Design a protein around this ligand. Sequence first.
Ligand code: MG
Ligand code: MG
Ligand code: MG
Ligand code: MG
Ligand code: MG
Ligand code: MG
Lengths: 103, 110, 56, 16, 140, 117
Amino acid sequence: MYAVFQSGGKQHRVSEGQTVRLEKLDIATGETVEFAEVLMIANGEEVKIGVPFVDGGVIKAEVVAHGRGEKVKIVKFRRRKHYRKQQGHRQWFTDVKITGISA
Amino acid sequence: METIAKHRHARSSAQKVRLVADLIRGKKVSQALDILTYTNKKAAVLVKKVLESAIANAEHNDGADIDDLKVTKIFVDEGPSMKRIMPRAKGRADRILKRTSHITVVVSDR
Amino acid sequence: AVQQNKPTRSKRGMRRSHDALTAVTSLSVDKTSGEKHLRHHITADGYYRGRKVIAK
Amino acid sequence: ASPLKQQRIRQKVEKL
Amino acid sequence: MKTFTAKPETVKRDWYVVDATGKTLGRLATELARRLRGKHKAEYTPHVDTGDYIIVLNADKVAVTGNKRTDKVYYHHTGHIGGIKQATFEEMIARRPERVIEIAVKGMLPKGPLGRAMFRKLKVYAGNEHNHAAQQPQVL
Amino acid sequence: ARVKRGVIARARHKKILKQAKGYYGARSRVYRVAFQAVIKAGQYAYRDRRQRKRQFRQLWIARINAAARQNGISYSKFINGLKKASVEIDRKILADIAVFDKVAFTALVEKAKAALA
RNA sequence: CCCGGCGAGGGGAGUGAAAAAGAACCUGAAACCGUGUACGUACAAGCAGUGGGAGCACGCUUAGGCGUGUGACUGCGUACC
RNA sequence: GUAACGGGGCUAAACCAUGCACCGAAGCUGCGGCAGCGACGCUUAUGCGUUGUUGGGUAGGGGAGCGUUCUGUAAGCCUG
Ligand SMILES: [Mg+2]
Ligand SMILES: [Mg+2]
Ligand SMILES: [Mg+2]
Ligand SMILES: [Mg+2]
Ligand SMILES: [Mg+2]
Ligand SMILES: [Mg+2]
């Protein structure tokens, strides 16, 4: 099977895949809580039942994974002009990973 | 070491002798002389005693013999710019550098 | 009769391109061990037939 | 004496 | 992981062939160039490399707009000063369908490398079959 | 009492001086780079990065066009079908599927094509 | 002791914790100049960086498209004071 | 030196009218975070969850910081 669903950005493509994202909202952990994200898989994608749009019905979902909810990155990013160099700011958004239990 | 034999100053520029000792490098040791003893000018004699050194120096520090060897590294580095002053007309500036150069040449083997 | 910027290292050698001497291609003579200039004969003592200067 | 060990000899003793 | 679509270093090419003769003029250039980049092509993200061979034929037949045929001019300029500039008709230049009239196409595309030898991938000839001397090797 | 400002010396300079993607010359040799090279990048990265989400945007929707207009009907009419379709409608980057799983895409084209009043 | 011109200078050997401490001598940065190696480079236009980004060189994960120098090619794009 | 569409080219790829579709900016939206500031909950110096909101900026105003040397700190502490 294959997949797709959003919640910030439409990153979902691969199978389970273990792949980046955003996070919860109070602080990732590692474990999980078993938060199955909600329907949108183009009926997966694979199998003679390679169904068209998403819902061949309701209740075709996945499950969490909490692949490891952290990460820095850093990007310099600091402007300039011709009579002042604001040169001073960096601001990532943290991030959580995931390995989503397949469709 | 695999026997060395430098100079130290000797007096005669970086580029001037970086020339000469480019012919030497790779083959050599036996070819040392031949291709210096003929190839003309001055720069190319202040190598033909640092080669006779870097050979007797492999018959002392190193027990190696006068037919082997290789000349696996040469380079001429920038010795102190020996400075003075020239007249000219009115005076302005005469930087005049009497420029110099250390030698180091190294022979070893396959 | 003067430049305006600085002829970078890059160009330092883009004249120098051509120089890097070339050396020889020498031969011996029937009578010296392996000397001989490219035109003058035995350095080893000095001659070609015989009494060139002082020989044998 | 091999023409470099000769270029030696012949001189190292045009010394002695 | 992270998307974009890879484009090996190309890894795919072709062998098409198209007549021209039919008075289609210039408008042909378009898909004669998009198909030289990748229109119909819905894969192989260009912008970096890509390609797709074509071979046009004759060309010495393409009605051209309306009056254009008599008037349209080209101007080469040799720059060897002597005060150059070389006006020339469509009429007069169709007395030699080489690089031009069919190379009103090299101007519909990128220019610079890529867009450089991205256009030699055209091939011209001035009389289809009979002296379509090009690689017979399989066309469409 | 003293300062011998010479200790915060290169500590201030090496600081940026370490900007040697080559760059070139004193553009990573001296302090010509000063900022006049790093402060450069240091802005180029601001926009010409910020720019990418429209530089990969137009990207997809060239492919997206080539696809559906290679099945009949193009990125203009196409999206129209798609949008008129509530829960039934997602959006590019994945409308890149047309390059790893055609039929999938080719199927989307259907669903889009048919929705068309 | 050895090369050298009864030179410069240098190589061994001795000293000594150390000579990478050798007397032009403590630490030994920068501008600047060499030698080694890897990627790039002989149809290619500009403040030379940015976003892509292949490929090679390299270390990698009992794939999972990774770190590193590189950077063909292609979107912008005329240093500062 | 074409050189008075930017060009290639368009007899529509020009013009009038009409209409749907789409591309398009840092605008708006979504989403993860920063700070200043009024509210809700809670605790409760407080904060913190949320929440309304504001943060282009030269002359200049105001407010927090960073590190350099010396000083008690200290015959303390690192340190062959
Ligand atoms: Mg946008
Ligand atoms: Mg020292
Ligand atoms: Mg090339
Ligand atoms: Mg990159
Ligand atoms: Mg401000
Ligand atoms: Mg101010």
